[PDB]
């Protein structure tokens, strides 16, 4: 339309209509210019042998991408509290994505002081892979999410991807995907961008805890873990963190089994034992990148699934013991709980076969999840010489561009019909006075979530 | 339309449809100010070479020009595989070229700094020669192609042209074109420029290698070439680099025969010999300009035609030997092979007569090949002095202008009909590991092409 | 690609994986230490699917 008239409006709201929900969210994003506009190869060889299982090869493109894949980008902690207490199951239906008010900047430094200045004409490229032709990196639970708190201006992560390798060296069946190779809309300070998508039919997430224990059809499959007691003295005095792993191996390379098949964290009454790789472990606000104390982190626990699913630190049964059991006919089992901080969809790989695709971290396994949305600044070159040069231009203006993002996802709900006479279990805050209200900013403006929140509260008969 | 509203969008795709293909490609570009806004004159003397062979005369103009003439611009090394393996030949039909998102930056130079700021009102001139009035430079296989790898940002080459000469002096017939006398379009920061073209009907390019040798009619014409061996002990220890080469002569100036009519590189089974001037020798990536040694240059070979065309290091026969042979009736031959890095078209000169006009370096010879596109910045004059002076203004504002460029060509194909029982040769990557992926960016960030690619793989009965 | 490496090499996960059970060589050294699964270490990242 034009430079002066806005390209959109700010919608953050949630509107509860009957059995369905519309949850919209809008944040600000700054996208710097990564890799000086240069695709490059990445691999760690720090040693001629390097690391057995930590060696990798791939590329690192300049494009940034949008991760909204987490629940707390769409839900205000109330709307979550409203969601878990009153409902048995839910599931996404449609997603609407609007990207507006692009603002481009030009960082020029003169006489020791660098001064930002609007570059009106410069453009920003964006596209959505709707054929899932690029590597799908949103499934790995990476940071870089939309921020949980609307007032937080956030920065956009970089997109790079990995491919086949032997040692740190690639092999011909690797492939190099140029992202420039797709058609992508360009945007100036006046344009916006919008698209919609329909979620493929997925079974509801079942948010409830069976109220009727299975043995009162045989319990589901189990893959044992080691057991760690949060109280340190209970644990053996040895470096068993990696040696005592539960690790599936592929192509000679080991992978710790994290989280593994859904299993109750611990037996009835013992809450201080968690399985080693068994649980998602979320860090509190301000938790350090490395070697942070046990209490800097929140530990998810699946007590609710214990009735049907076998405990993660005890063996399955006796025929000698049986540590790892497959699928027998007549099993039943429950999924892994989805949490406020935890992911939503994770893309199913494309194979000739799979079994019960619901992904081990939780969420909705989808052969066709919401596309990636890739973005970069149109590179604007610095003054090229008057003398013609064969080589490509290696010097560009510094630049970055900012603006708004909105997303609106329609969730369909399943009401509670229960005939239970006595009261349910609801999730409520505590009245007990405290220095700072949970789930709100402290005196420096730091929005900090004190606890994970699971979705299994209401109960059913088995 | 306006400042803030993007004029045109990034299109880069390949669309494989039935028998015909569409390859669109885009690039980013910066245009300096050439020759300080002055038509100039150039001889060998201004360059400094005193030979008669290298004598020339002509002008060198501000206007820039686009060159997509090279295959690697439109086709991505995937396609040029899928393009060659599966097909008995091709040719272009329609080329569409656009140019949008002009931006104009006015470099400012201080005592120690030069800050770039937009000059919104400034303009850019562009036009295309559709009547083929100007000289046509695209037929010399010059540098300055659109880069092969889309994220590159390529500098536009200058436009200059040679005219008739005696020594460094002209003759009255030597003529001088002033491009400003051609009607052109003027583009401020909001306007775009686009046209379409139609390739005049030419023979399909022949992509195939005859399975059956001619002697199992007569072979085609031959002009011998001194045989040079990549085993440098075998080669005679003498300075035969210039004296040895065959050279077609004109107007008293000997011009090397480059490459010359299509002939086989070497006798079957001897791969280390090559025509001294017969075959194109592409520079590898990273290769310097001058006095390079052997491994820094890829060397094509014509082996696929060794059935029909006679060896370029051999005599055509005996009658006493025959070193050169013109066309007899009842001859047959096949033209030179187009390569991924090679040219696409050249312009059949305007004459009263010619024979088999399809060019030597490969590609599709045309009497109305795609027009050139010339471009320049309309100069903004610096402040005049308050009192008139008849002179032309010699002081201008230092600018360059950048933007996008995109081109869409439609190739047509000819299917493979063969009833051959046993499998073919197909071009492919080599699975074996390597420190880098061929045809992809390394750790440094510079895109390299390891090897040329011919178009002749499938076989036909002769 | 391959099923273990589906991860993105540039960006740390928000999941933490226990990395140390002891402080150092000695007696009564039991301790817990958690860390981010990140491109630095890719063997331990929590992944969706298993062969």
């Amino acid at each position, epitope marked *: 339309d034009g430079v002066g008239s806005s390209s959109g409006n700010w919608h953050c709201d949630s509107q509860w209509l009957g059995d369905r929900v519309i949850t919209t969210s809008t944040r600000t994003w700054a996208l710097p210019t990564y*890799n*000086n506009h*240069l695709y490059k*190869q*990445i*691999s*760690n*060889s*720090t040693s001629g042998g390097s690391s057995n299982d930590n060696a990798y090869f791939g590329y*690192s493109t300049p494009w940034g991408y949008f991760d909204f894949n987490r629940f707390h980008c769409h839900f205000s902690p109330r709307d979550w509290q409203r969601l878990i207490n009153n409902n048995w199951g839910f599931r996404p239906k449609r997603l609407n994505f609007k990207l507006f008010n692009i603002q481009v900047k030009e*960082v*020029t*430094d003169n*006489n*020791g002081v*660098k001064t930002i200045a609007n570059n009106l004409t410069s453009t920003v490229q964006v596209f959505t892979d709707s054929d899932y032709q690029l590597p799908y990196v949103l499934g790995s639970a990476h940071e870089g999410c939309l921020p949980p708190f609307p007032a937080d201006v956030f920065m956009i992560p*970089q997109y*790079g991807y990995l491919t086949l390798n032997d040692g740190s060296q690639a092999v011909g069946r690797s492939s190099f995907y140029c992202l420039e190779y797709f058609p992508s809309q360009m945007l100036r300070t006046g344009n916006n961008f919008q698209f919609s998508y329909e979620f493929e039919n997925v079974p509801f997430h079942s948010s409830y805890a069976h109220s009727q224990s299975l043995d009162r059809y045989i319990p589901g499959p189990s893959y044992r873990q080691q057991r760690v007691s949060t109280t340190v003295t209970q644990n053996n005095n040895s470096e068993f963190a990696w040696p005592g792993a539960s690790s599936w191996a592929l192509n000679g390379r080991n992978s710790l089994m994290n989280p593994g098949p859904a299993m109750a964290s611990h037996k009835e009454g013992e809450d201080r034992f968690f399985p080693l790789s068994g649980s998602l472990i979320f860090g509190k606000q*301000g*938790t*350090g*990148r*490395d*070697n*942070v*104390d046990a209490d*800097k982190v929140m530990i998810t626990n699946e007590e609710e699934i214990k009735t049907t699913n076998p405990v993660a630190t005890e063996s399955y049964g006796q025929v000698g013991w049986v540590q790892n059991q497959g699928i027998l006919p007549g099993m039943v089992w429950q999924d892994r709980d989805v949490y406020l901080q935890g992911p939503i969809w994770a893309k199913i790989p494309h194979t000739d076969g799979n079994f019960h695709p619901s992904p081990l971290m939780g969420g909705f396994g989808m052969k066709h999840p919401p596309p990636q949305i890739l973005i970069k600044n149109t590179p604007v070159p*610095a003054d090229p*010489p008057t003398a013609f040069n064969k080589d490509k231009l*290696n*010097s*560009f*203006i*510094t630049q970055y561009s900012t603006g708004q993002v909105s997303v609106e996802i329609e969730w369909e709900l399943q009401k509670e019909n229960s005939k239970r006479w006595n009261p349910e279990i609801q999730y409520t805050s505590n009245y007990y006075k405290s220095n700072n209200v949970e789930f709100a900013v402290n005196t420096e403006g730091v929005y900090s979530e004190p606890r994970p929140i699971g979705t299994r509260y209401l109960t059913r008969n088995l | 339309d306006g400042v803030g509203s993007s004029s045109g969008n990034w299109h880069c795709d390949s669309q494989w449809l039935g028998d015909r293909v569409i390859t669109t490609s885009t690039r980013t570009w910066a245009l300096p100010t050439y020759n300080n806004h002055l038509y100039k004159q150039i001889s060998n003397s201004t360059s400094g070479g005193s030979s008669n062979d290298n004598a020339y005369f002509g002008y060198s103009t501000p206007w820039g020009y686009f060159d997509f003439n090279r295959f690697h611009c439109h086709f991505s090394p995937r396609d040029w595989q899928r393009l060659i393996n599966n097909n008995w030949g091709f040719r272009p039909k329609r080329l569409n070229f656009k140019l949008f998102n002009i931006q104009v930056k006015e470099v400012t130079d201080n005592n*120690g*700094v030069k800050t770039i700021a937009n000059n919104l009102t400034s303009t850019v001139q562009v036009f295309t020669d559709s009547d083929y009035q100007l000289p046509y430079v695209l037929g010399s296989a010059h540098e300055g192609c659109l880069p092969p790898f889309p994220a590159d940002v390529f500098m536009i080459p200058q436009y200059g042209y040679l005219t008739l000469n005696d020594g460094s002096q002209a003759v009255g017939r030597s003529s001088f074109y002033c491009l400003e006398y051609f009607p052109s379009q003027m583009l401020r920061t909001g306007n775009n420029f686009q046209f379409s073209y139609e390739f005049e009907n030419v023979p399909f390019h022949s992509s195939y290698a005859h399975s059956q040798s001619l002697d199992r009619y007569i072979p085609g014409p031959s002009y011998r070439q001194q045989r040079v061996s990549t085993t440098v002990t075998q080669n005679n220890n003498s300075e035969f680099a210039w004296p040895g080469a065959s050279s077609w002569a004109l107007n008293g100036r000997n011009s090397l025969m480059n490459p010359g009519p299509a002939m086989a590189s070497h006798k079957e089974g001897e791969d280390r010999f090559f025509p001294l001037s017969g075959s194109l020798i592409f520079g590898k990536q990273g290769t310097g300009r001058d006095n390079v040694d052997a491994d820094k240059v890829m060397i094509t070979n014509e082996e696929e035609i060794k059935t029909t065309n006679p060896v370029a290091t051999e005599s055509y026969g005996q009658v006493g030997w025959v070193q050169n042979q013109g066309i007899l009736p009842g001859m047959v031959w096949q033209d030179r092979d187009v390569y991924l890095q090679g040219p696409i078209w050249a312009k059949i000169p305007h004459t009263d007569g010619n024979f088999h006009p399809s060019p030597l370096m490969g590609g599709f010879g045309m009497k109305h090949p795609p027009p050139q596109i010339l471009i320049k910045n309309t100069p903004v004059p610096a402040d005049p002095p308050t009192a008139f002076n008849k002179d032309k203004l010699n002081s201008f504002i230092t600018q360059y202008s950048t933007g996008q460029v995109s081109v869409e060509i439609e190739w047509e194909l000819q299917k493979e009909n063969s009833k051959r029982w046993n499998p073919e040769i197909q071009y492919t990557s080599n699975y074996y590991k390597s420190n880098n992926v061929e045809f992809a960016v390394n*750790t*440094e*960030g510079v895109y390299s092409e390891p090897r040329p690619i011919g178009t002749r793989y499938l076989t036909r009965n002769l | 690609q391959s099923l273990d490496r589906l991860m993105n*090499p*540039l960006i740390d996960q928000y999941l933490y994986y226990l990395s140390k059970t002891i402080n150092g060589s000695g007696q009564n050294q039991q301790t817990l*230490k958690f860390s981010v699964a*990140g*491109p*630095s270490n890719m063997a331990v990242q929590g992944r969706n699917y298993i062969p």
Partner: antibody
Amino acid sequence: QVQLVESGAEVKQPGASVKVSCKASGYIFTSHNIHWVRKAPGQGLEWMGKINPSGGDANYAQKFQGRVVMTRDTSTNTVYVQLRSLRFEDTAVYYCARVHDFWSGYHRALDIWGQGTMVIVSS
Amino acid sequence: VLTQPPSASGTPGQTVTISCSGSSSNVGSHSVNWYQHLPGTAPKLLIYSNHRRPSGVPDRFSGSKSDTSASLAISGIQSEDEADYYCATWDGRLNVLFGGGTKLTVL
């Protein structure tokens, strides 16, 4: 091999400004930033800030935000810091180092440093 | 800016654990690196990241980083090894923050 070369020393009396030069020889020179670390006698290393090679825009340090000015040139392939107001306090050996990522997006460190530079400032 | 011990003892054939400490924003979110500096010569990058050593560096040098505090411990020492050390780190704007001079004494 990747190398960074400061110029020779100068001796400049307080109030004088002295620029320093760093020649990046053997690499692209636009993909990596260049950090200026200073050491004044009996003091720790001190970071005068970085320039973004291709960018031309610099990020200075809290202490040096006023006085220090950074400029570069791609053609001569060198980068310049200019300390406009020399003082007795500002007597140090100046270094230019580059960020080097060791072929990984994730890691950042100053792998290559120049041989050195020393500024003797005294009236 | 980081706070580390300024003077650190040594004796031939003994390891030396060199401590560095910082706030969560400055060092928690950022990997510390250690630079070895000899007066009159350019600094060397011993350890880049928490536990990694560059190809040039010897096997004995190592690194142990934990939340705020990030240490360094070197093995089989010599007086030929003895020089000044530094604790380098990166903030949110990626300003580089050097902890302070720690120089050994070998005797």
